[PDB]
Amino acid sequence: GSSGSSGPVAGPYITFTDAVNETTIMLKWMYIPASNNNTPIHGFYIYYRPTDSDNDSDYKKDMVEGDRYWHSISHLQPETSYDIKMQCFNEGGESEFSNVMICETKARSGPSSG
């Protein structure tokens, strides 16, 4: 077709963002084949970082099966509202950067409930 950037461009789109725990978060992404080149994906990368961070330098990367549309992040900060995003990749090349989803974790409660 065109000449420039090959691979899955459409990129995935996050349509679900919730906090499984004070240090855990569950987010699900969707795939739009319509505007896709029916190309096979290697997996799924997920970036995350606390708003307290300095720059992307913090943003991490979590690979996930290409057939997986769900991922539960861990080792996060409690009641910490930070931006979250993800992106897929394949032999062809990395896809576009998904949208920025703000998923606020749960409050780090104590042993005594109120």
CATH architecture: Sandwich
Looking at CATH, the homologous superfamily is Immunoglobulins
Secondary structure category: mainly beta
Shape: elongated
List the total number of helices.
0
Helix coverage percent: under 10%
Spatial strand sequence of the major β-sheet: 4-3-6-7
Name of the level-1 CATH class: Mainly Beta
Number of strands: 7
Q: SSE order, as H and E?
A: EEEEEEE
CATH fold-level assignment:
Immunoglobulin-like
Distance between the termini: 62 Å
Strand content: 25-35%
What would you report as the Rg, rounded to the nearest angstrom? 16 Å
Largest sheet: 4 strands, antiparallel
Organism: Mus musculus
Glycosylation sites: 21, 55
Subunit structure: Part of a complex that contains BOC, CDON, NEO1, cadherins and CTNNB1. Interacts with SHH, DHH and IHH. Interacts with NTN3. Interacts with CDH2 and CTNNB1. Interacts with CDH15 only during the early stages of myoblast differentiation.
Subcellular location: Membrane
Short key terms for the protein model shown above:
114 residues; mainly beta; 34% strand
In short:
Part of a complex that contains BOC, CDON, NEO1, cadherins and CTNNB1. Interacts with SHH, DHH and IHH. Interacts with NTN3. Interacts with CDH2 and CTNNB1. Interacts with CDH15 only during the early stages of myoblast differentiation. By secondary structure, this protein is mainly beta. The protein has no helices and seven strands.
